[PDB]
Amino acid sequence: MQHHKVAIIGAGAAGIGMAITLKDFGITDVIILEKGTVGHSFKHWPKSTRTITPSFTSNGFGMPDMNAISMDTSPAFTFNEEHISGETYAEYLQVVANHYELNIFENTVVTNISADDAYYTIATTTETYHADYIFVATGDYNFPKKPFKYGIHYSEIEDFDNFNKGQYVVIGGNESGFDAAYQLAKNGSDIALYTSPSVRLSPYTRQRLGNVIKQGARIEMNVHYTVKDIDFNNGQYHISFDSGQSVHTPHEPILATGFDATKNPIVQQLFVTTNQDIKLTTHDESTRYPNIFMIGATVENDNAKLCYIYKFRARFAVLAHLLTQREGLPAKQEVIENYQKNQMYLDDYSCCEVSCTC
Amino acid sequence: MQHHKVAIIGAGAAGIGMAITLKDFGITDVIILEKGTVGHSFKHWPKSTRTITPSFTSNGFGMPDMNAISMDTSPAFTFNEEHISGETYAEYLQVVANHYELNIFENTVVTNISADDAYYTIATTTETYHADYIFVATGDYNFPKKPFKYGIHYSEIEDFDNFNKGQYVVIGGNESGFDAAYQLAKNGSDIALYTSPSVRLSPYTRQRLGNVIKQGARIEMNVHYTVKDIDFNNGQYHISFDSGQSVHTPHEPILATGFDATKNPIVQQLFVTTNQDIKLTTHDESTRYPNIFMIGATVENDNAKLCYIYKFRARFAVLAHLLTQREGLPAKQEVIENYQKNQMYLDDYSCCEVSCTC
Ligand SMILES: Cc1cc2nc3c(=O)[nH]c(=O)nc-3n(C[C@H](O)[C@H](O)[C@H](O)COP(=O)(O)OP(=O)(O)OC[C@H]3O[C@@H](n4cnc5c(N)ncnc54)[C@H](O)[C@@H]3O)c2cc1C
Ligand SMILES: Cc1cc2nc3c(=O)[nH]c(=O)nc-3n(C[C@H](O)[C@H](O)[C@H](O)COP(=O)(O)OP(=O)(O)OC[C@H]3O[C@@H](n4cnc5c(N)ncnc54)[C@H](O)[C@@H]3O)c2cc1C
After folding, report:
1. Alpha helix (H) ranges present in B237-294?
2. Is residue B130 within 8 Å of B116, Cβ to Cβ?
3. C-alpha pair distances (Å), B345 with each of A101, A156, B321, B334
4. Contacts of residue B358 in chain A, CB cutoff 8 Å?
5. From the CB of residue B165, how many other CB atoms can be counted at a distance below 10 Å?
6. Per UniProt, where does FAD bind (chains A, B)?
């Protein structure tokens, strides 16, 4: 019934962060609608997965803990950990949501959003809600890319310890693929990795991988290979490539293949989704519906992929301000200045240009 | 002979960083005078010591790698490491010094600085130099606190592996003391730690310490003890405390006791050094001599201890600007704005107030 100012779809990193930022800009009539519980995606990381980005409570001197979604919070503070488990990060989001008294509705699958006269109407599996501004914060963890007949996606592994010691193949040479190799190899398995790469790799994964290898771990990498299909016959898996002889392997291959936000129905209803790409204005706004915005790790602008918390969280306050100006309210320059001083006001993508001189 | 604009005493983290920042503000007639080689202190860390602060190349999106001493550099970039060895950090400072073409004079022990009419005169063991502005960047690693008859200071250990497996005592329950315990315990020794503390500890050291302990390591901590003296008699070391029965131990105790910058002759000549405290103006300037400043980890203001790279490096550009204004040159607002945007313009200590809400 209520004519809410804001509805945020999804109570993940981006939705919780955005709700806190909106509060700082004086916007409190905000509901968050979540299909599972706060931090759903993080709770479904494999058990051993840790953030590659390290948490340190540098919050006082100009940059908040890189994994924090608000200026005054820090997983390193709450948990005394540097590399955070998904389970711990879910709890971080719960601790922060409880503290800032966010109005969140769990176990509510948003099914349809449409325009009415005075607001947007939000159909869910629970009840209907209404709001002026919508922040689509739905991510993509539930839409992993599974292009072949077989293969276990990284996102569907509960615990790499459940795999018996043996011979495994990993497809995708990225952060998750090398993590998969490292998790399996640390338990004594032999891994073959096929990739479309160690040069793009974060220090955390690079050092962990290098240490098990330096200690004799058997991890091999084949570097100019693209998988055509995976089939199962004659008691084993057969990986066929575009250019190259097929390969056979005893256990199901692990796919570190990525995800696709355009597969989300809500994204399809609210944005132009031309080609696995979500079209947004320079203010992260839908080009179809006004006052509908996209937030989180799925925001790409080909001036920045925004896939890290420390990147996508810098947009929150830029949108909160825009919202206050469209509402005819004065600019909250005390607040805008805190965000700017703490690296959380990315208003110009021209200066996201990341490159070191040596 | 030359009437230099600037002389920086010390080519450590702070001296190299300050020279690069001065260059960005258009001040290039800068000499750096170093008693050893670039990064001398780091080269004399114990071999196993790593920065507790993690390096990640976040440089593009508003905060440079926390261990970097300039905006456009990153040990994570150059070395693909997160927790940096002292040896690697020395090389980082050398790579950056070579790239920015700093004018550095190694193996030059500065012995005396005094006022002349048109500039300051700098007596060294090599030759005499002259400069308008002096940045005292001498640190304190060579003045460890050794208050007892015996004890091996943490800073004088080359390699914790050289200690035979056995029974050790560590005095001081801080980052270095817990590192000492962890290094010895990981090689199977039993450690007794005496402290004036795990709550102040960084995530990196907390997790490493907790892991060896969880794996059965024998590390014990006695928490309300102050060492009076250490003596050696009857084949062993005797630790006597203010309040408490003495203790006896077979090997020389390891002191994680800290350092004292006021023991440096150059600091004594240029600052009021009342009580292990160095008196500075709100612009890090000497209260005795104008245009003489203190930079680095030794700058404390009881509004901030500035003992971390990410803290003390934020003062560089504030001083560089002050210098340009005293020179009657226009404010370089392009530069001032880069520094401000990258968390490296700490002009007001009132906002160094570090405290998380949860
Ligand atoms: C394995 C892995 C490791 C990562 N490691 C790092 C790291 O080291 N550092 C870093 O900065 N980032 C990391 N990330 C990247 C990024 O931070 C995460 O993807 C993060 O989850 C992005 O946050 P989000 O809010 O955009 O999405 P999510 O956290 O996925 O939140 C989306 C939420 O919306 C909900 N939802 C979806 N559809 C609906 C609907 N129809 N109705 C209601 N609710 C819905 C979901 O249940 C979910 O909780 C990692 C990601 C992955 C997958
Ligand atoms: C063991 C240890 C671990 C640390 N870990 C971290 C970390 O995790 N993260 C972090 O941010 N900081 C860390 N630090 C804190 C701080 O960053 C270091 O102390 C750092 O060395 C400070 O840099 P500096 O330039 O002020 O001093 P220094 O690096 O010590 O530089 C001073 C230089 O001046 C030279 N010098 C001294 N006297 C003279 C003279 N008379 N004439 C010419 N040259 C002279 C010296 O040779 C030396 O090279 C750590 C420090 C120690 C001791």
Report:
1. 265-270
2. yes
3. 34, 45, 10, 13
4. 73, 78, 95-96, 99
5. 10
6. 14, 34, 41, 52-53, 110, 297, 309
Q: Which domains are assigned to chain A?
A: 2-143+258-358 (3.50.50.60), 144-257 (3.50.50.60)
Compute, in angstroms, the gap from residue B36 CA to the centroid of ligand 2: 12
In the structure encoding, which two tokens stand for residue B169, read together? 């005592």
Distance A13 CA to ligand 1 centre (A): 6
Contact indicator for B16, B89 with CB cutoff of 8 Å: no
Does ligand 2 come within 6 angstroms of the Cβ of B253? Answer: no
Ligand 2 center to residue B303 CA distance, Å?
Answer: 21
Is A69 among the annotated ligand-binding positions? no
Contact (Cβ atoms closer than 8 angstroms) between residue A218 and residue A185: yes
Nearest to B352 among A53, A54, A60 (CB): A60
Residue of A nearest to B74 (CA): A356
Please name the residue whose Cα sits nearest to atom 3 of ligand 1.
Answer: A51
- What is d(CA B45, CA B156) in angstroms, rounded to the nearest whole number? 8
Q: Any known ligand binding at A41?
A: yes
